Each structure stands twice: as structure tokens, then as C-alpha cells.
Design an enzyme around this catalytic site. Structure first.
Site, PDB file in Angstrom:
ATOM      1  N   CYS A 282       0.787  -1.301   0.040  1.00  5.25           N
ATOM      2  CA  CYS A 282      -0.046  -0.006  -0.051  1.00  5.25           C
ATOM      3  C   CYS A 282       0.862   1.218  -0.175  1.00  5.25           C
ATOM      4  CB  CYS A 282      -0.952  -0.021   1.130  1.00  5.25           C
ATOM      5  SG  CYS A 282      -1.526  -1.597   1.903  1.00  5.25           S
TER       6      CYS A 282
ATOM      7  N   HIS B 100      -7.442  -1.792  -2.575  1.00  2.00           N
ATOM      8  CA  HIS B 100      -6.617  -2.828  -2.314  1.00  2.00           C
ATOM      9  C   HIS B 100      -7.003  -4.131  -2.680  1.00  2.00           C
ATOM     10  CE1 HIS B 100      -4.886  -0.075   1.281  1.00  2.00           C
ATOM     11  NE2 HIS B 100      -5.923   0.645   0.697  1.00  2.00           N
TER      12      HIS B 100
HETATM   13  K   LIG Z   1      -3.432  -6.202   1.046  1.00  4.43           K
HETATM   14 ZN   LIG Z   2      -2.903  -2.617   0.465  1.00  2.39          ZN
END
Ligand SMILES: [K+]
Ligand SMILES: [Zn+2]
Ligand SMILES: [K+]
Ligand SMILES: [K+]
Ligand SMILES: [K+]
Ligand SMILES: [K+]
Ligand SMILES: [K+]
Ligand SMILES: [K+]
Ligand SMILES: [K+]
Ligand SMILES: [Zn+2]
Lengths: 426, 426
Positions: B101, B283
Site C-alpha cells: 500500500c 486494495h
Molecule cells: K493487501
Molecule cells: Zn494494500
């Protein structure tokens, strides 16, 4: 202009890489940089698996201090090693791997080994870490983190020379065939790197190892230079030295003769007489640092990639962006060459299909300026469509490095032409 | 028998994996294990790059503590995070990345972003590290180190649902088409993982994010269950739950709705009105742990791999190992199917050629026992050559899972048959 500067200028122009001080000495590969990166890895994996008899393995990244002590890396490679301790209550000491030798010894030792399977060759395309000074970092040549076609061969005495000659063959494929570089005919010379001040093992063995290496060196007919004290702590090596356009030299590949690590891991195979015997290890890397290799490609090509490597393989440019006929023909080609699938069906992208990096510039800008932009980006091909091209239903296509000439090709011909280029590394 | 036990039994029988206490919780992929591993990665990269509009990036593995503090991972993900301090004189604190991330936020922020390029999708096939207890380690399901098709999407509000639906489409391709698994029609159910006790950001935003997710959930028509408090600290998520043959559940994929990380990295793009605006992040991971995915494939297939995945695609067995005619025909086939090149020429292995994992058992053992060995190894095909086969110049070939029937095929037909199988994931 320096190589680091050339690498940076090309990187900015083509959006290849980026760095951030929250991860000093480690590269970020932007989409275009990653395309080149992955292309190189794909190429090398192919040669190693289907030509040079290697089997790829995948290994852990971190190992307990103990393994490094057992190998001799902890002390004899202390300054280069990236050492850590966990910050949990029970602080365990670790080393991010600077190389795969020990891990590959664990693998060799995991199964009973026979002379039947020698030479036993393992390749490993993993991230390596080496903790060197901030003031030592330079572009893609000196990094804390880098990728390598690490590889280790386990063989018998009579197999050493043949294995090293095949190693040299792969090296020549990379540095004296596939890629163009700009003193001697070869794009490299060999450093005969001899016993270091701090070496493990017996001196007479070391003398023997250096004798074998030199004999191979002589039989090869390749130019070489004595490189005193630069051998690994476990053995002497042949270091492949490539020369800058600023006449600075860089090690890009290596072949290391190792009679020592097998001793330290108690490695053995059952010979053709049912007796047990130590295998000899040959450490090897053809790209060395893949990042360093890319930097040196750029030092030569100045961003002008070969078609097969280029993140910018072709751009399609309609003369009039408002013209439906030109647009349709352009779009038709882009779809054909990109060979993509829709995310609306369950139909999967098949293995081994062709996909080309071709873009379509329909920006509302004069055609002359869209062309100039493509030129600056070093697109391998410029594909222009005007009224005459629509009429003939053939595309005007010219290669980046050919100044005047051009071809008029159908969609199918361009498709097959690109397949030919890429398939065989043009 | 447990799944971990089944995975271990298959691993030993096919030489897939190995472990070592000098690297606890991290797998070694032996050549055969790596073949399966790489096959899965190759397949997934294809779908993401050429079907679902993703661009792969390559990122550092370690980042300074600061980045993790900026993201909120350092505290809100402290126990799972693999924290270290270097053991050099100046002890810097680091985190091996447990996910991508933050790194992908750095990348997003590196260039000026426009609504033109949204949704902006980055995929990253890197090693992730998570430091969990020894007594929590199990086979390939719970590891300290694992690989993931990490991925992050940066989009606008009106793009969220479409992006998540396409995410679900890819998930279905993997778990409800390409692979066979052994309650409902689908091989998974969705966990609606909601706000955790420790969350970053504003509650009304959280409420909004959970509302959007639930609406998508309802519109999908897919069965789902409420999973209170199991959301990420940055947002709620849809967790893909696959069920053991022992009826134990495992998260294998995830889709996370994140309105928070963009805030913390001051992310912005220029909208269709020249104003600046926070992108929304999704995500995503389809395999999740690739190691865990392999363990679950094994839980179902018990080592009986699909042809395209099998490290043992075909074995060639001459009835009489002393017979030159049988041997020649066998060798001819192995060379054709393996499609390898010699290490004595400078001719490179071309891109996108076909290469099949086929072996030749000419061991001095009764033919019946060589066949039994092949059966135990789960070869997808058994290819037998006797006098009649030599006479007809056609090979006797039968599929592992078909009991009585068989084909008599030429060398060319077998070649094309295997291409067909692998090309389209059989
Ligand atoms: K993830
Ligand atoms: Zn992520
Ligand atoms: K020998
Ligand atoms: K090495
Ligand atoms: K114009
Ligand atoms: K012409
Ligand atoms: K909008
Ligand atoms: K017999
Ligand atoms: K038949
Ligand atoms: Zn080595």
C-alpha cells in the site's frame, strides 16, 4: 554527461524508475521500467532453463545469523552484509541474503545426491541486499538492493572446465551477441581475481583452484588481466569487466570456483564407485546486478532500446484526429497489436500469446508535434495514418533509426513483422 | 489426514518444497515446486496486464520506520509487522513490507496525476513478510514469508463499483472456472469485514465506505456473511473465503475499500474541472498468499495437477530399454516436446516457444514398475512405446485420470495436443 546522469535523463523521459529516501539504495520500477526489467528476466530464464540445463529454485530472503556463520559470510563478508536484529522482545539476529550460496547448499543437502545428476545446476532470480555507504550509491550501478541471476553448479572435477566454458558461452550470448555496446572485439575483458587476504580453507587447494581457472582462461583465448586479492573468501573467480563510454570499468558477471563451501556444509554425493565425495561448486551470475546491466545498456543506447525490450514499441498517429476513417484504421491496429481481452467475459488470456507495447496519440495537437513527442520517447516504430493510408488500407510505418525509408504494410504484416522482431531479440 | 499433511505428502512425493529452521516460516521451492509457483504467477500476470488493465511495478522490500508511521501500519499493524533494527553502529529501524500500500502511494505521488488515467491500477508480485508466532505456522497456509499478487487501484467515486465488479470477475475466473475445488455453487463465500476497533479516519466516512461495499455486495447476488471488526485499519473489505475438505475456512483473496491512506499521503489528482481531489484506493489480491493457494489446490487435487500446471506433464516409457528402435522413437519425442537448445551454439532460446515437462524412464527396471512409479508421481500422461508402436510409428498415450481408453498419436499430434492443453489451462 555521466552514466548515472544518462540513466537519470532516460528514466525521466521514459518514466522508468524512481527513488525515495525512505528506502535508500533501492529502486522503484515504474510500469515502463518494470517492462524492461521483466523482459530481461524472461529472456535469461529461457536461456538457463532451456539451453544451459539450469533448474530455477525460490528461496527465503532472510536467514538466521547461524547460517551465515556456517558459510563464513558473517565474518568474511561482514562489511557488505546487511545485518539486522528483530525489535521484538526476543531479538534474533538476521542477514538479508547478499547471495544464494548457503541457501543452495541447504537445497543440495536436502536430498541424497548421486553422480547421476551432476552437474547439478540451480538458478535463483531473487532480490539481494548489501549494506554499503550512502556516499557509494550511484544510479543503478551501486545499490543496497538489486536483482541477480544468482546460480550455483555442483559438479565433479572432470566437469569443471566444461561447465565454465558453457558459462562463458552464455556470457558471450548476452554481451557479444544479443546486446549492442559502445576497444577489443569483445565487449568485456576478464579479471583473474585471486586469493584474498582473508580466505577460508587450505592454501594448496587454493593454489589448485587458481591453477585450474588459469588453464581454462588460457584455453579460452580470451584476453584477461591479473586481479590480485579480489577473489571471494571461498574461491578465485573470473570477473567479467565491461567498459563505460567514459572508459570506467564495471564487473557485470562472474564465475567463481569454490572448493570450500562444500566442506563447511559437509556436502557429498555418491560417486560411480559408491564412495562419497565432495562436489565442487561454481558460483555464477550473467547479468550480475540486473539494475547495473540496465544502466550499462542505457550508457550505450541512450534510451534507444531494441524493439523487443522497448516499453515504447510503436505509436500510431492519425493525421487528422477528428477523422473517423483514420481513427478506425488506427484503433483497429492498436487492438490487433496489443492483443488484449475484455474484463466482461470469463475468457482468460492464453499462455504464449503476443502482446505489443503500442500507443495511440489522438491528442488534440498538430500532427508534427505528436510525431516530435514520439521521437523524443524513442518509440521503435512510428505508424502514421492519413487519407492515402485509409484509401490503400496500408499503414505507413518507419523504424526509429532509419532516416528516410519506410514500409506500407497491412495490419497482418505489421503483426507478423513485430512477432519476428521480438521472437528473435531485435 | 489434515491439509498440511496432504501438502507435505504431495511435496515429498513430487519434491515440491522444503523448509529449514535457519529460516522459520519461509518456504524453499525445489525445482518442481518452483515450476508450479512460476506457472501460477505467469498466469496471473497475464490476466492482470492483458485483461484487467493493470500495470506491474517493482518495489523495495524494506522501508524506514517513518513510512510505516506515515501510513499507520507501524502502530495499527504492529503485531503482524516484521520489525527490525540494523546492527551497524547507527541502528536504523525498518519494516520488511507486509504489504505494498504505502509504496504504491509513493509511486502514485511521484508523478502529477490526472482524471485521464483513472482508474490507475498497479500490481506487484513481491515477497511479503509478516512476523507471526512459531506455534501459528502451518504448511503453506501460515508463513512468515509469502508471495502475493498485491495490487492497488486509484479511482473516482463513480468508478468504485465497476472496479470492484471487475475484481470479482477475476476472482471468479480463478476460483470458479480455471481451477477445480472440492457447498454452494461457488467455491467461496464473501466475508463482509467491517470497521475494526482500531481504525484511522472519520466515522462518517467509514459508514459511507461500508454502505457502498454492502450495496455492491447486494447487487452482486453472491452469498455473503457479516464479519464484524475484521476490516483493515484503513477500510472495510470483502474477504474471499474458501472451504477445506475438513470444512475449515480460509481467506484466499481480498478487496479493500480505502478512503484513508490517500489522506495520510496527501494524494490528489486533477479532476475534470481542474480542481484537486483525493483518489479512492481499492486494495486487492486474487491469490492472496500464493503459497496458501497452492496448499488449497493440493487439498483438492491430492497431487493430481492439471496438465498445464504439472511439473510432471508426461513420461515416456520404452517397453524394452535395450531396444534401439523403441529408444530412438522415445528420444525423438522427448526432444520434440522439451524443445531445448544445445549449449554449443550461440543460438538463443526464442520468446514464447513451447516447452513441456516430459521425462524418459529408461531405468533398468521391469516396465510394469516404471509405470507404477509414473502413476505414483501423478504424471498427466503416460506414453508407452513397444514394438507395435515402433512399427506403426505412433505413440501409445493415455491420460492419468482416464482408466481404459487411450490414443495412438504421431509426434506432431502429441506436440499440438499438449499446446492446446496448456495454452488454454487444462
Ligand atoms: K493487501
Ligand atoms: Zn494494500
Ligand atoms: K571424476
Ligand atoms: K555470487
Ligand atoms: K495540423
Ligand atoms: K513499400
Ligand atoms: K466522479
Ligand atoms: K519386463
Ligand atoms: K486411436
Ligand atoms: Zn554464490
Amino acid at each position: 554527461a555521466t552514466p548515472a546522469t544518462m540513466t537519470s535523463m532516460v528514466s525521466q523521459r521514459q518514466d522508468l524508475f524512481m527513488t525515495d529516501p525512505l528506502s535508500p539504495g533501492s529502486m522503484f520500477f515504474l510500469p515502463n521500467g518494470a517492462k524492461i526489467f521483466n523482459k530481461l528476466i524472461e529472456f535469461m530464464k529461457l536461456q538457463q532453463k532451456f539451453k544451459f540445463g539450469f533448474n530455477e529454485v525460490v528461496t527465503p530472503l532472510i536467514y538466521k545469523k547461524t547460517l551465515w556463520e556456517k558459510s563464513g559470510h558473517w565474518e568474511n563478508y561482514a562489511d557488505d552484509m546487511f545485518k539486522v536484529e528483530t525489535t521484538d522482545e526476543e531479538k534474533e539476529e538476521y542477514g538479508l541474503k547478499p547471495m544464494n550460496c548457503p541457501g543452495h547448499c541447504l537445497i543440495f543437502g536436502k536430498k541424497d545426491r548421486s553422480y547421476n545428476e551432476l552437474p547439478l545446476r540451480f538458478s535463483d532470480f531473487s532480490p539481494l541486499h548489501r549494506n554499503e555507504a550512502s556516499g557509494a550509491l550511484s544510479g543503478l550501478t551501486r545499490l543496497r538492493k538489486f536483482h541477480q541471476d544468482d546460480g550455483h553448479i555442483f559438479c565433479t572435477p572432470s566437469q569443471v572446465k566444461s561447465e565454465i566454458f558453457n558459462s562463458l558461452k552464455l556470457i558471450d550470448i548476452v554481451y557479444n551477441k544479443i546486446f549492442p555496446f559502445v576497444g577489443a572485439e569483445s565487449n568485456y575483458f576478464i579479471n583473474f581475481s585471486t586469493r584474498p587476504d582473508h580466505f577460508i580453507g587450505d592454501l594448496k587447494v587454493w593454489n589448485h583452484a587458481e591453477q585450474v581457472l588459469k588453464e581454462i582462461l588460457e584455453e579460452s583465448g580470451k584476453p584477461w588481466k591479473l586481479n590480485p586479492g579480489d577473489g571471494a573468501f571461498y574461491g578465485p573467480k573470473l570477473d567479467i569487466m565491461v567498459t563505460d563510454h567514459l572508459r570506467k570499468t564495471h564487473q557485470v558477471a562472474t564465475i567463481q570456483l569454490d572448493f570450500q563451501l562444500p566442506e563447511r556444509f559437509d556436502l557429498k554425493f555418491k560417486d560411480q564407485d559408491n564412495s562419497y565425495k565432495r562436489p565442487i561448486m561454481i558460483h555464477r551470475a550473467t547479468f550480475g546486478s540486473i539494475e547495473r546491466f540496465m544502466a550499462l545498456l542505457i550508457d550505450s543506447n541512450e534510451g534507444r532500446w531494441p524493439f523487443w525490450l522497448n516499453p515504447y514499441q510503436a505509436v500510431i498517429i492519425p493525421v487528422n484526429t477528428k477523422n473517423v476513417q483514420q481513427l478506425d484504421m488506427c484503433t483497429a491496429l492498436q487492438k490487433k497489436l496489443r492483443n488484449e481481452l475484455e474484463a466482461d467475459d470469463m475468457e482468460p488470456v492464453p499462455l504464449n500469446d503476443w502482446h505489443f507495447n503500442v500507443d495511440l496519440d489522438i491528442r488534440n495537437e498538430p500532427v508534427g508535434y505528436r510525431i516530435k513527442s514520439a521521437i523524443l520517447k524513442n518509440y521503435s516504430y512510428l505508424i502514421i495514418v492519413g487519407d492515402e493510408e485509409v484509401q490503400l488500407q496500408k499503414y505507413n510505418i518507419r523504424e526509429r533509426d532509419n532516416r528516410k525509408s519506410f514500409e506500407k504494410l497491412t495490419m497482418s504484416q505489421i503483426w507478423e513483422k513485430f512477432i519476428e522482431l521480438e521472437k528473435n531479440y531485435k
